[PDB]
Design a protein around this ligand. Structure first.
Ligand SMILES: NC(=O)c1ccc[n+]([C@@H]2O[C@H](COP(=O)([O-])OP(=O)(O)OC[C@H]3O[C@@H](n4cnc5c(N)ncnc54)[C@H](O)[C@@H]3O)[C@@H](O)[C@H]2O)c1
Ligand SMILES: NC(=O)c1ccc[n+]([C@@H]2O[C@H](COP(=O)([O-])OP(=O)(O)OC[C@H]3O[C@@H](n4cnc5c(N)ncnc54)[C@H](O)[C@@H]3O)[C@@H](O)[C@H]2O)c1
Lengths: 327, 327
């Protein structure tokens, strides 16, 4: 079939090093879907030369699905006619750098990339933001792209989701693939709330199976929330490969469909569950025909409302801090 | 179907960081083949802790095919009942380190790993050596495993093969997937000889298509031979991801079959083309039912004989240098 143009930022970085090869292999859009890769990196010579090196490796894999591949240093050419965009590039937090400094640095990246997408990308481009702060960066881009549909801007909560999945399987001794209806609410941060109240394994309640809510509060939630730190403490570096996998899972499920299965996607709130409209928030959704749908009717108990309130408040703090860059 | 046990050495290293996730995803043995991963690293705390970190990431990917995964610090437990083994771990060359020092350091690794495989692995295990010097390390392991069939010990020449494929496609402007009958002879080193004399594209001669043998000698051969250096000069680090891909290609084609297509595999010479028996050498082969077969009847012109003689001589120099460690 006709090739899809996939734009990827931060292409000479670690996450992309595990990501690009899997997209070219056809893991993201199907083994029958040819892809064109439009890679973006900062204008600096060092980053551009490294991006050249990565492209050399991609050619050396002889991928039958790779219909084309170009390098860019300008978001205006990188996002040209893009059908899908994975915004992985972002400004990390260094020494002496405060939170306000982090938010502004990233705001200035995403307002520009958002405007670029608005101007030259496909009119119905699917956007996924991986770069941190994911949810907030997705909000800035969305706000910076008035001509595109807001529902097309998403943030990745899939890594939190898969990490939660892993812990449940390890706890129940059941295969990770048998777990259903598990999901995560909120911000991709330690304040995320992995909700296991509706999760089932073979039609049996995971919550009742474990029958120890103390485990839920003092073990399950804190472990998933701090998993990234655990990996950095063990390997010395970030969790690049699992983050790349989660990104593939996100786009794959969004475009191809979950077949009734529930999943987690950071999407713009339509007001469901008392979440202010516009706020990019983790919600349980099902997908079909390239569209998502928020699972309605879930009960929100006291504990859940408190966790939701915490993750929501962190998001409102981030939004307040970049508000001046918008407009 | 019943899970296959795959043993992988150098598991906390770079090549494995791109390799492990793709094997677990089912790229190596099929989407219907469950796998058990038995990972090996040196006994050192730092390497073992990093290996623990990589395993955490693998769990966080929620791979339905991963039937199990264990970490080891002893080759005797790591190779236990292994159906397939990818020997990626090896001693790299440092400052002041001479060639004789490199050969001995690696000889001492591979004699031990070879004996271990001999003792505890499946009686028909498939072995692939990626660690450099690949061909020679494969020879040491094979020699160190008298109870196993010698044809089961191979070295990876697939990266040289795919790199040659890439250059031909770029030169002819034809899709990399349309190229047939291309292959590489010899040692996985700059002395390798990518032979394009029988390569075809749509039933048309690639050699006649290019019609410039000077390009072959002074451009094609030197570029493929030094491609690894070109990548290190661009990225600052080795070509981990393309090497990992080539390893998957190697095992995949060997186990699943090439369906008549020719490919390159570093195998023990049976004496074909005047190559001394026992020498692990790159040969054009076809595969079927988990077995390979050397393509016979190719013409070897003067130029080819000289290139073959050079790569062969380098291999004999390496063999002479480790001979004292065998027995
Ligand atoms: N959402 C999640 O689940 C999740 C998880 C882990 C990490 N992350 C985030 O993903 C992002 C990338 O992580 P990484 O480990 O690959 O980092 P990295 O530093 O290895 O790579 C980032 C790359 O982005 C590039 N870049 C910087 N500014 C850019 C710009 N404005 N345009 C295009 N490219 C740009 C950099 O030059 C760099 O090569 C980070 O912000 C990281 O914290 C997200
Ligand atoms: N054959 C090819 O096509 C090809 C191409 C490129 C590189 N290589 C080679 O592959 C090997 C690995 O490369 P890398 O970039 O992943 O290196 P790396 O240094 O990142 O990783 C090697 C890993 O092997 C481990 N190791 C060392 N000794 C070991 C042992 N005796 N048993 C088990 N594990 C051991 C190390 O601790 C390290 O974690 C090297 O020898 C490299 O030069 C082969």
């Amino acid at each position: 079939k006709t090739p899809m143009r996939v734009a990827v930022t931060g292409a000479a970085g670690q996450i992309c090093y595990s990501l690009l090869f899997r997209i070219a292999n056809g893991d993201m859009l199907g083994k029958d879907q040819p892809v064109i890769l439009q890679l973006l990196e900062i204008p600096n010579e060092k980053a551009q030369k490294a991006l050249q090196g990565v492209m050399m490796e991609i050619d050396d894999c002889a991928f039958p699905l790779l219909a084309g591949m170009t390098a860019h240093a300008d978001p205006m050419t990188a996002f040209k006619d893009a059908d899908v965009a994975l915004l992985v590039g972002a400004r990390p937090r260094g020494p002496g750098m405060e939170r306000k400094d982090l938010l502004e640095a990233n705001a200035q990246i995403f307002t520009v990339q958002g405007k670029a997408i608005d101007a030259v990308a496909s009119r119905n481009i699917k956007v996924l933001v991986v770069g941190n702060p994911a949810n907030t960066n997705a909000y800035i881009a969305m706000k910076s792209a008035p001509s595109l549909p807001a529902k097309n801007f998403t943030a990745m909560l899939r890594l939190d989701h898969n990490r939660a999945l892993s812990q449940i399987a390890a706890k129940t001794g059941k295969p990770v693939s048998s777990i259903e209806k598990l999901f995560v609410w909120g911000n991709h941060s330690p304040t995320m709330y992995a909700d296991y109240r509706y999760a089932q394994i073979d039609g049996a309640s995971v919550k009742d199976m474990i029958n120890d809510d103390a485990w839920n509060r003092d073990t399950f939630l804190p472990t998933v929330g701090k998993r990234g730190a655990a990996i950095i403490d063990a390997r010395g570096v970030s969790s690049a490969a699992s983050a790349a996998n989660a990104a593939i899972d996100h786009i794959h499920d969004w475009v191809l469909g979950t077949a009734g299965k529930w999943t987690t996607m950071g999407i713009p709130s339509d007001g469901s569950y008392g979440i202010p409209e516009g706020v990019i928030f983790g919600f349980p959704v099902t997908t079909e025909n390239g569209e998502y749908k928020i699972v309605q009717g879930l009960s929100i108990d006291a504990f859940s409302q408190e966790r939701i309130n915490v993750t929501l408040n962190e998001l409102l703090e981030e939004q307040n801090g970049v508000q001046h860059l918008l407009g």
